[PDB]
Design a protein around this ligand. Sequence first.
Ligand SMILES: [Mg+2]
Ligand SMILES: [Mg+2]
Ligand SMILES: [Mg+2]
Ligand SMILES: [Mg+2]
Ligand SMILES: [Mg+2]
Ligand SMILES: [Mg+2]
Ligand SMILES: [Mg+2]
Ligand SMILES: [Mg+2]
Ligand SMILES: [Mg+2]
Ligand SMILES: [Mg+2]
Ligand SMILES: [Mg+2]
Ligand SMILES: [Mg+2]
Ligand SMILES: [Mg+2]
Ligand SMILES: [Mg+2]
Ligand SMILES: [Mg+2]
Ligand SMILES: [Mg+2]
Ligand SMILES: [Mg+2]
Ligand SMILES: [Mg+2]
Ligand SMILES: [Mg+2]
Ligand SMILES: [Mg+2]
Ligand SMILES: [Mg+2]
Ligand SMILES: [Mg+2]
Ligand SMILES: [Mg+2]
Ligand SMILES: [Mg+2]
Ligand SMILES: [Mg+2]
Ligand SMILES: [Mg+2]
Ligand SMILES: [Mg+2]
Ligand SMILES: [Mg+2]
Ligand SMILES: [Mg+2]
Ligand SMILES: [Mg+2]
Ligand SMILES: [Mg+2]
Ligand SMILES: [Mg+2]
Ligand SMILES: [Mg+2]
Ligand SMILES: [Mg+2]
Ligand SMILES: [Mg+2]
Ligand SMILES: [Mg+2]
Ligand SMILES: [Mg+2]
Ligand SMILES: [Mg+2]
Ligand SMILES: [Mg+2]
Ligand SMILES: [Zn+2]
Lengths: 137, 143, 172, 191, 52
Amino acid sequence: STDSIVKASNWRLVEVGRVVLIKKGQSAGKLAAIVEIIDQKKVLIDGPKAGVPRQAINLGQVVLTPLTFALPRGARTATVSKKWAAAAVCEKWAASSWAKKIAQRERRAALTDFERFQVMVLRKQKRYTVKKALAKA
Amino acid sequence: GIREKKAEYFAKLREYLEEYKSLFVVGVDNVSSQQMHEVRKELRGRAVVLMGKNTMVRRAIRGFLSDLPDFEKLLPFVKGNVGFVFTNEPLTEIKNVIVSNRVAAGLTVVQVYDNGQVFPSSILDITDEELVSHFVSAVSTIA
Amino acid sequence: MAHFKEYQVIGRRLPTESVPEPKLFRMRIFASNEVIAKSRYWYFLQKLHKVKKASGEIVSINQINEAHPTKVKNFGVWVRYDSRSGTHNMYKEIRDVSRVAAVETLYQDMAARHRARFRSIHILKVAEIEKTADVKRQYVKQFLTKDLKFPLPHRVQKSTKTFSYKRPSTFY
Amino acid sequence: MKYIQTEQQIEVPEGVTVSIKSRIVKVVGPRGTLTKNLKHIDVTFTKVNNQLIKVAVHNGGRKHVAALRTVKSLVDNMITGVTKGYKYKMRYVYAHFPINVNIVEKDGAKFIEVRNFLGDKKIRNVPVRDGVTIEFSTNVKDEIVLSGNSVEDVSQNAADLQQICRVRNKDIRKFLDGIYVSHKGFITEDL
Amino acid sequence: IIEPSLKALASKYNCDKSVCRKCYARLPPRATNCRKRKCGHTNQLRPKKKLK
RNA sequence: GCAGUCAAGCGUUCAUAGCGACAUUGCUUUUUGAUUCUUCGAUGUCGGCUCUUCCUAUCAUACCGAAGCAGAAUUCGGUAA
RNA sequence: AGAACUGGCGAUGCGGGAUGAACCGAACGUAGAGUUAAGGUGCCGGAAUACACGCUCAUCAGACACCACAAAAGGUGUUAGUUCAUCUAGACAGCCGGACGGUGGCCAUGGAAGUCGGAAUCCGCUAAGGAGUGUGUAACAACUCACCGGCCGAAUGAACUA
Ligand SMILES: [Mg+2]
Ligand SMILES: [Mg+2]
Ligand SMILES: [Mg+2]
Ligand SMILES: [Mg+2]
Ligand SMILES: [Mg+2]
Ligand SMILES: [Mg+2]
Ligand SMILES: [Mg+2]
Ligand SMILES: [Mg+2]
Ligand SMILES: [Mg+2]
Ligand SMILES: [Mg+2]
Ligand SMILES: [Mg+2]
Ligand SMILES: [Mg+2]
Ligand SMILES: [Mg+2]
Ligand SMILES: [Mg+2]
Ligand SMILES: [Mg+2]
Ligand SMILES: [Mg+2]
Ligand SMILES: [Mg+2]
Ligand SMILES: [Mg+2]
Ligand SMILES: [Mg+2]
Ligand SMILES: [Mg+2]
Ligand SMILES: [Mg+2]
Ligand SMILES: [Mg+2]
Ligand SMILES: [Mg+2]
Ligand SMILES: [Mg+2]
Ligand SMILES: [Mg+2]
Ligand SMILES: [Mg+2]
Ligand SMILES: [Mg+2]
Ligand SMILES: [Mg+2]
Ligand SMILES: [Mg+2]
Ligand SMILES: [Mg+2]
Ligand SMILES: [Mg+2]
Ligand SMILES: [Mg+2]
Ligand SMILES: [Mg+2]
Ligand SMILES: [Mg+2]
Ligand SMILES: [Mg+2]
Ligand SMILES: [Mg+2]
Ligand SMILES: [Mg+2]
Ligand SMILES: [Mg+2]
Ligand SMILES: [Mg+2]
Ligand SMILES: [Zn+2]
């Protein structure tokens, strides 16, 4: 294999349309979209569908997701909304294991005591047939 | 002093668009100082050449788009090593002086100006191999 | 000095014998509350005209909110400031989404780079730069290119718990 | 002022391939193969195509950005050395005592040994680095010529031999003796 | 002895340099500043004195 | 007592190789003074002898850089107690 | 060493300044609950290895009033800034082309034509080309620069401020 092989490190980019998970604060847990770049540490984000108000944010308190969609620099909320919808962003998001893990996390946290109990009894039943399978091959 | 000099360059250029009524855009790629000096001697009568820097021409032309706006469509022919030959004589006696005289191992022509029209320097040297038949190769169509 | 606010401060000399109704003057002032705003009005008004507040009054205080607070813009900032050895004039650019933002980082910057505390700094003029590429300072100009995008290498996730059972990764 | 992105370019001539992983550059051309550990510098490599590789420094300042250009040059000399190769010539310079130079070896060593230096009874020895080869010119008086795939190991070996001849306790303006590098060039492509 | 071009060679190492007027450091002939941190990177250089 | 900044001069010529005036910034606490805080119901007051250890502003010895370093001799400087 | 007004110490503990008469905070019956001051919150040590924008790498870094020192003088470290100048009539840099005619200009001498060397430094033609930057020949050649241009596309030089 005589090619030049250069391990091309593949970063999430801060760019217009890069969608981001908001980490801290009033809009914690929600998805926004980068609209314009302010400086090396600040951006202007907007998350119309999610209910996060258009604002300047410190790139610190937001986490870049791999999701990025088509959006013209500096777009107003209204069209930010129009394009995100068009882009089926939310759909792609909820499809990621990142998204699902968040929700599983969310679900366990919700279990009542009794519920929690049942999970044990079922985990017990599934283990039986699993140890069984295991001990056969 | 460079404000002075440049200003005058437009002057001796603005004065060659009003004087002469036609213009050759030549492609003096290579073509030494000596060679270029001798084409001056071989055009001393009618013609005159004026070599210029491009970004001073493409701007001075646009800045002359008042009177003589026909010269506007020179610009897409002012790239590369170019020069200006102004004249009043016919085509194939000036261009025949230019393209021919002096060479080794000769400056070319890239386009021609006339009354707000352009000539590929090829359609200015017709060898009458269709100029005669223009009233002959269709004259038999009338009979 | 905290979260800054901009104030229209308007005042006039007190009325008199010869001048019933004297001339109103206005300043725009970046201060963090009204009490400072009005005090910084009288500071300058002592230095420009020769009013003392004892012989004047403050006709109005109004907060000047930012027009388009969610539109990123490039501000030009003119500053007079005092140093350990002299007093100087400056110009700098700050890219932000509001006037009040711009000033906060101006005041921080003057303090990091030149060790200038609030007191040693007059804000001369702060004005949006309408025509891009009137932008003079590079550290802003490099954000103005078409299709700008950059990565954010070496990401350090803050840990909650004190021990972790996996050797972390910095992989944004 | 912290530069948002700044990059450099490395032309990969025909014949040589270059593979890079965790910043350990491997370079194979006709002459053979050279590797370098550039891990000590945060530069990120990207291959545009087998002809051209780019080197970038993201969000870096003055000095960080300064490491970029030198990284390019390092990867370049890797390449040219693995194609044109390197060749330093030297010259014995002596006013009265002829400098006798030879290759000896102890335990398959190969040292450059140097004798009679300014009338010295001491026998100097410069080890010959691996990968660099020492020849003696045949039409140039007192020449000596080191050559090989890396400038680095060649240049050093040359400097190594020239250092060993420094002249102590004499006005070194008068006593010019030594072995000095007289030409730096390639193996292919003229001399 | 030693032909002019070899004298010229060995001068490129021994004679054609500059000196720091603070710490005597032997420096590149076109040098503007001294490399040594001890003399505070001074730019008070002189040329290495040429022989007879 | 020691060390700097300036560079008029010295140095055949050439400020600074080695020096450096008129001025000026310092450092030190083996000088001398100034003070009088401690001891006057008592800290034995010079020199030497003996012995240990410390400082470095290095006289020698190691390795260097510099010169008005040809060699020899020397001088200036660095790392060095 | 000696005066001035006030506040202290002395006569006074307490919290802070590790330490300490005199600083900061605050003055004191025996106690409970709360809140603070000055000062702190990596660990010693009660209290965010909090948040945010910068700056700094010291083979002698630095780290908080009183306070346990530093100066004239200097740095092509690095940051921000100032002024003059150049540049969209296209600079700077980088590559690439041309680098001409009177003319081997004049004296000089084995010879010396731009370049051992004396005296000037004129002109033409020019977009530009010195009676010549250097390499070079015995002397021409040959190469080369200053100068102009083809491309590139927005910055570049110099002096400074802290
Ligand atoms: Mg001041
Ligand atoms: Mg002030
Ligand atoms: Mg010596
Ligand atoms: Mg000697
Ligand atoms: Mg050298
Ligand atoms: Mg040192
Ligand atoms: Mg001298
Ligand atoms: Mg003298
Ligand atoms: Mg002397
Ligand atoms: Mg006493
Ligand atoms: Mg007693
Ligand atoms: Mg006793
Ligand atoms: Mg007794
Ligand atoms: Mg010492
Ligand atoms: Mg030394
Ligand atoms: Mg001398
Ligand atoms: Mg001698
Ligand atoms: Mg002797
Ligand atoms: Mg002697
Ligand atoms: Mg001395
Ligand atoms: Mg000892
Ligand atoms: Mg008091
Ligand atoms: Mg008493
Ligand atoms: Mg008290
Ligand atoms: Mg203390
Ligand atoms: Mg007080
Ligand atoms: Mg402890
Ligand atoms: Mg604690
Ligand atoms: Mg270092
Ligand atoms: Mg103070
Ligand atoms: Mg500085
Ligand atoms: Mg200006
Ligand atoms: Mg550049
Ligand atoms: Mg060339
Ligand atoms: Mg050229
Ligand atoms: Mg001559
Ligand atoms: Mg000659
Ligand atoms: Mg010639
Ligand atoms: Mg200033
Ligand atoms: Zn030095």
